[PDB]
Amino acid sequence: MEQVSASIGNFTVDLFNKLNETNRDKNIFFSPWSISSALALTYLAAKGSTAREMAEVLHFIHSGFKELLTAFNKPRNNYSLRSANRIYVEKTYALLPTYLQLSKKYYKAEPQKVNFKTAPEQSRKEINTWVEKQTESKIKNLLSSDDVKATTRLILVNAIYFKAEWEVKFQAEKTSIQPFRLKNKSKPVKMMYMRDTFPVLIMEKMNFKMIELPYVKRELSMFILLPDDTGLEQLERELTYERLSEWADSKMMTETLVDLHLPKFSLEDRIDLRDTLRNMGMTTAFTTNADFRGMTDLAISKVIHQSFVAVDEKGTEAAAATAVIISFTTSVHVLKFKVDHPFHFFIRHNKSKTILFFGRFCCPVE
C-alpha cells in the first residue's frame, strides 16, 4: 500500500506540471488517483515496451490497487468515493481470460466488448450512460459524437464522483462577498469563514503556510498550500511529492487557533489525456503496434477522464441538513489564514497518504 501511494504521488506532481505547461494561466484540477487506477487496467494488459513506458509514466506489486480500492470503496464510511473506470473494445477483438480473471480480481471491473464497427454513435450512448450510472448521475455526456467513431478501437474512460461533509461545517450566515486578489487584478467571491483549530504549517523558508482542513472523522482531508503573499510560480517549482509528504506528515505541522477565510469555490474538469500521456512518455500504447497482448491477440484510441469538486460550507457535493447550529463565541491570539489569493489544494486519504484530487486555484475568471 505504501509503495503505490508514492507512485501516484509522483505521477500526480508530474501530470500536474505537464498540464500546467500548456495552461500556465488556467486552474488545474484532476484525480491523480482516478487516472493511475484507470491506467493500471490497460497496464495490466500492456506487455513488452508498451509497459516499460507506461510504468515509467505512472511511476511503477499490483495488489496495491486492490488493497486501496477496497479501503476506499469498502467502507471508510463518512465519504463517498464512487468512481467509474472501464475498458471498451470492439465486439471484434479477442479477450484472453487471464486478463479478465485479473481485472475482476483486483479491479472489480470487467472490460466490456462493444460494437464500434457499425454502432459508434450508439456504443457511445451506452458508455456515457454507464458513466452516468456509476457517478450518481453527476457526470453527463462524457463522450462527444467526435469521441466515438468506427475508427475507434479501445476506449478507456475514467471518471469519479465524490462526497464528503467537512468535519466542522462553516456557517452560511458568515459567508460574505469578498475580493479574491489576483497588484492589478481582482474579482469577488463568496468567502466562507470560521475560527477554529487546524493543523497548520508555517515556514518563511519557502515563504508559504499550510493548513489541513479535515473531512469527517479526519479520514480524508483537504490541504491548502497558500503562498504567504499569481505568486504561485515559485512555490510550484519547488513542488515535489517528497516535500509534500515530508510536510503534511511533518511533525512540524501543528494545531493552531485560526481565523479561516476559504473561498466557497468550485472546479470541474474533463481531460482527453491522449496528447498529455503521449508527451509524458506514453506513446506506443496508441500506435497500432501496441503490445496489449496482455488482453488481446489494437491500441488505446482515447482516454477520457473527468473529475470535479465544489468546496462549500459542507466540503463538497454534500447531502446536507445541519439542523441544529449552536456556536459559542467565547473569549480571548489568531493565525490569520486568509485564503484570498492563488493557492494549491489537494485532498488525501490521510490513512494511506493517497492523493485523490489535486489542484491549483487562481482564477474565478468566468
- Can you read off the three cell numbers belonging to residue 336? 490569520
Runs of H (alpha helix) within 251-359: 274-280
Residue of 300, 288, 282 lying closest to 49 (CA atoms):
282
DSSP state of 203: -
Amino acid (one-letter) located at 315 = G
Residue 361 CB-density burial (10 A; 0-12 exposed, 13-18 middle, 19+ buried): buried
Instruction: Evaluate whether the domain defined by 1-165+263-313 bears CATH number 3.40.630.10.
Output: no
Element (H, E) at 56: helix 48-58
Alpha-carbon gap, residue 338 to 260, rounded angstroms: 6
Is the distance from CB of 230 to CB of 20 less than 8 angstroms?
Answer: no
| CA–CA separation, 41 and 111 (whole Å) | 9
Resolution in A: 3.0
Q: Any idea what the Cα angle at residue 247 is, between residues 221 and 83, rounded to 5°?
A: 35
Amino acid, single-letter form, for residue 240: T
Residue bearing cell 509503495: 3
Q: Tell me the residue ranges of DSSP E strands in 65-137.
A: 83-90, 112-114
Distances (CA, A) of 275 to 24, 302, 304, 336: 17, 10, 11, 42
Cα 239 from Cα 308, distance rounded (Å):
22
> What are the extents of the domains in the chain?
1-165+263-313, 166-262+320-360
Strand partners, 271: 305
Residue 122: in which H helix or E strand, if any? helix 120-134
- Among the CATH numbers 3.40.109.10, 2.40.50.100, 2.30.39.10, 3.90.79.10, which is that of 166-262+320-360? 2.30.39.10
By C-alpha distance, which of 32, 316, 303 is closest to 155?
303
Element (H, E) at 45: none
Question: Other C-beta atoms within 10 Å of 51: how many?
Answer: 20
| Beta bridge partners of residue 179, listed in sequence order | 188
DSSP state of 173: G
